């Protein structure tokens, strides 16, 4: 499903992918890369099958991808009506019924009117004379683009930071921006136990405040609760993210956290969007103090930087190390970095090694002389374009 | 200052005792045991002196006992007038001034009336038309026989356990009954730090609730606050006492807690009186809840037993082991221990070894057959005498 990777021959190992048979939908694009335009006159695919698996394998060759559905109580439809009656375009209930006539479900050929009552129960909409008007929680969910199923928990979770908050460490702030657990990595309980003990006094206070138990953490799982399970994995996700924003080596996290670099950036990119949705959610809800703490946490989770390098990182070619080594060069803001001597940044960028050898996302490789010039050149354009 | 120990010769090491010159008062009784009555016709005392210390040493010989004082703002006088006007005997202020004419200070030959004003400020006394009446705090302090200086802190300390309490472990209850630190032992910070880490999760919750800091505990003292000092040493006294009421061996405490067995009994006997004063203090103050929790903690601290052996220990001949081994013999209460077979308790008492060899306080040594018969015989008298 990714970027086009042309190749003359395509080989598939088994019709069974991860213990399950290969889907036809992904199979069409699975082979579709075979044959380069204007270079290769013939492209081929060789699916590999054994014993009785050939009967299952051949079915994909003569099979066709399944027809599309609408997937529309349903959690994907609650947001649908919330997206229209909160924007103010559709107010009368009868006109809302015509919206359900405009969807994919209607065009394919009851509970739609019974689903707005679900929103009525959860304070998302106030009932008036029927003509519906959004509430403070309803308008905040739409602006931040969260699913209404998740918001009910967040609203009761963010409001539980009202009772008690810690500020020495970023853990409690990070705990409220970790999205979920999904299946981003396989947990290691014994490894978590050793990490649980070595945690400092400040961080252990956070866990008790959000429901994580010191007495039960990597203790009962060894010897053997869905909402309690979604909290412990949420805490582990927050522990990993705190090391990410501390700029610890990514290799070191592997040796310490058990999850490899592939699932780390697939989480810090996903958790950075969450911090960009909680911040907007708290902005529209009139929580000006909470928006202050989470305002800078979207930029920190994306790039794995500290507070110091937030301004340096604004240049698109400084991801996580090209700004740290540059920061030690006496350049602490992007304003005066834009005025750096061109020949000066060449030597400092040469060092710190863990002709197109330096890499920048989007333009493949680059040479050091050009990229260092691009560091200043991009900094020129930022200073006057935003003022 | 203890029990008489006659001897024909008494020899003293140095006039300097513990880095200070020896007092005259203790010197009269220092060698007064020399010469047995009706056995020794001559008793002698030989003080050993060196170099120039002989001039200081001879002052002991020709010295006379220092004249007595009264030591009577003064903390020992606040209790003096509280103890009388709260009993109802002295009410009028002029009669109180007459009482101050009856003291040792008066008979030896201004601020007496000013010390009442100290009691007025601290709510110990309500002011009426001057005729004075007790308050709820004033009548509770007298009955429990606590110094008014200590009560002001206890009342706030015991009202902080009002808001938050823990019950799974006996630590927080023990924290409210540890008297002070005095100079019962020399603290070991590094050993406490290792002990601080190995504390379970439940006990560490108590320390944060009473002012003890996980971050600062055997951390700053190594690298280098009187009320903060008196709390940490209070916590150590409560930490030691919990092992005492867990029936752990006293030898093991020495290897683990660093304080010798001599200072342990000098604490558990002193801390047992405190539990007998806090319980009475809470009784008169109308706190019927922790009067229940602290009711059994005077007997536990005196004998270093658990809850199970509270009834067995009522017999004066079962201190801390003679009841534990007897408890495992199927005898769990003093009611049915009174009906035990005489020959049965002989064999069980013979075992558990860590003719008059078994020892009982107050009667020197005893033989096993007599003492085992005394275990039952004392239990006979208790059953009907108390009913």
Swiss-Prot record, chains A, B:
Its job: Low-fidelity DNA polymerase with a helicase activity that promotes microhomology-mediated end-joining (MMEJ), an alternative non-homologous end-joining (NHEJ) machinery required to repair double-strand breaks in DNA during mitosis. MMEJ is an error-prone repair pathway that produces deletions of sequences from the strand being repaired and promotes genomic rearrangements, such as telomere fusions, some of them leading to cellular transformation. MMEJ is required during mitosis to repair persistent double-strand breaks that originate in S-phase.
Subunit structure: Homomultimer; forms homodimers and homotetramers. Interacts with RAD51. Interacts with ORC2 and ORC4. Interacts with RHNO1; interaction takes place during mitosis and promotes POLQ recruitment to DNA damage sites. Interacts (when phosphorylated) with TOPBP1 (via BRCT domains 7 and 8); promoting POLQ recruitment to DNA damage sites.
Protein name: DNA polymerase theta
Disease affiliated with this protein: Breast cancer: A common malignancy originating from breast epithelial tissue. Breast neoplasms can be distinguished by their histologic pattern. Invasive ductal carcinoma is by far the most common type. Breast cancer is etiologically and genetically heterogeneous. Important genetic factors have been indicated by familial occurrence and bilateral involvement. Mutations at more than one locus can be involved in different families or even in the same case.
Family that this chain belongs to: Belongs to the DNA polymerase type-A family.
Subcellular location(s) of the protein: Nucleus; Chromosome
Free-text comment about domains: The loop 2 region is involved in the binding of the 2 ends of resected double-strand breaks and homomultimerization.
Sequence segments annotated as region (Interaction with RAD51): 355-387
Tissue: Highly expressed in testis.
Lineage: Eukaryota, Metazoa, Chordata, Craniata, Vertebrata
Modifications the protein undergoes after translation, according to the UniProt entry: Phosphorylated by PLK1; promoting interaction with TOPBP1 and recruitment to DNA damage sites.
